[PDB]
Design a protein around this ligand. Structure first.
Ligand SMILES: c1ccc(-c2oc3ncnc(NCCN4CCNCC4)c3c2-c2ccccc2)cc1
Length: 271
């Protein structure tokens, strides 16, 4: 709908940027207030760093994916500098939080709890015929109550047919991406499942980079041999085996996110 009819467009005056959370090539992300009292996250696009349409494309996908487990779109300011305002998560990115004094003290019980929360969110994405493509601990945000939500929908896509095929030149993080995606550029929800497996290692190691001591080339070589990531230190065996399911050769053999959620919930209510 046109901005003068869109429920999400808001006057820039309603926003007060207070603290910068990140700065990059394409813009910045700030902590701010909407109408003085409501804490928000404000993403600002760096003019000319990239297409405004590309930037706003994420906010429109977000309009179609609203759920408690996904960072919620709040509003947009479609006049340069373009802004996308979203729900604020007090404890930042999961990968960072797990390294703080609080994160370090978390029990395996709570880690499994968070893992399930993430699977729950992905289960919603799964059911709505969408894919994320950037599922990693850095893209999971943590609330003041230690609840987790999926974030960063820049690469997310609505899957009209079973799969999405990227651009031959498109490149992705080798360590978190499924083989079929790395090799054919083909992404499905099953590709996200593989990524979830890697994310689980990020959780249990409190933010460590996957495939410790290995380069991307080494990771690919080993995977082709049928090897999978070595058991992380102090990783419960049941969780490791759940990770293995996520890394099955055949995408169709990998479990659904609802299955993953269900199992993780049992792991949690057991510990
Ligand atoms: C301390 C520092 C930041 C926050 C922090 O709180 C947040 N709430 C909502 N959204 C955010 N943006 C997610 C952006 N993704 C894309 C960029 N990488 C992270 C995820 C952030 C961030 C944030 C983290 C890292 C970089 C930018 C913004 C909270 C406490």
């Amino acid at each position: 709908k046109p901005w003068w009819e869109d429920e999400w467009e808001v006057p820039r005056e309603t926003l007060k940027l207070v603290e910068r959370l990140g700065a990059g090539q394409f813009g910045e992300v700030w902590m701010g207030y909407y109408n003085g009292h409501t804490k928000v996250a404000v993403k600002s696009l760096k003019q000319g760093s990239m297409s405004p349409d590309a930037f706003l494309a994420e906010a429109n996908l977000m309009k179609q994916l609203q759920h408690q487990r996904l960072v919620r779109l709040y509003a947009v300011v479609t006049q340069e500098p373009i802004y996308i305002i979203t729900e604020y998560m007090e404890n930042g990115s999961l990968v960072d939080f797990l390294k703080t004094p609080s994160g370090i003290k978390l029990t395996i019980n709570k880690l499994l709890d968070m893992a399930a929360q993430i699977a729950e969110g992905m289960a919603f994405i799964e059911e709505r015929n969408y894919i994320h493509r950037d599922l990693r601990a850095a893209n999971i945000l943590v609330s003041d109550t230690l609840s987790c939500k999926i974030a960063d929908f820049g690469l997310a896509r609505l899957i009209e047919d079973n799969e999405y095929t990227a651009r031959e030149g498109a490149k992705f993080p080798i360590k978190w991406t499924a083989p079929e995606a790395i090799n054919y550029g083909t992404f499905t929800i099953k590709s996200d499942v593989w990524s979830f497996g890697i994310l689980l290692t990020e959780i249990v190691t409190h933010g460590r980079i996957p495939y410790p001591g290995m380069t991307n080339p080494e990771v690919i070589q080993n995977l082709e041999r049928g090897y999978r990531m070595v058991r992380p230190d102090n990783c419960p065996e049941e969780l490791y085996q759940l990770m293995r399911l996520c890394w099955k050769e055949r995408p169709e053999d990998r479990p659904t996110f609802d299955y993953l959620r269900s199992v993780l919930e049992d792991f949690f209510t057991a510990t």
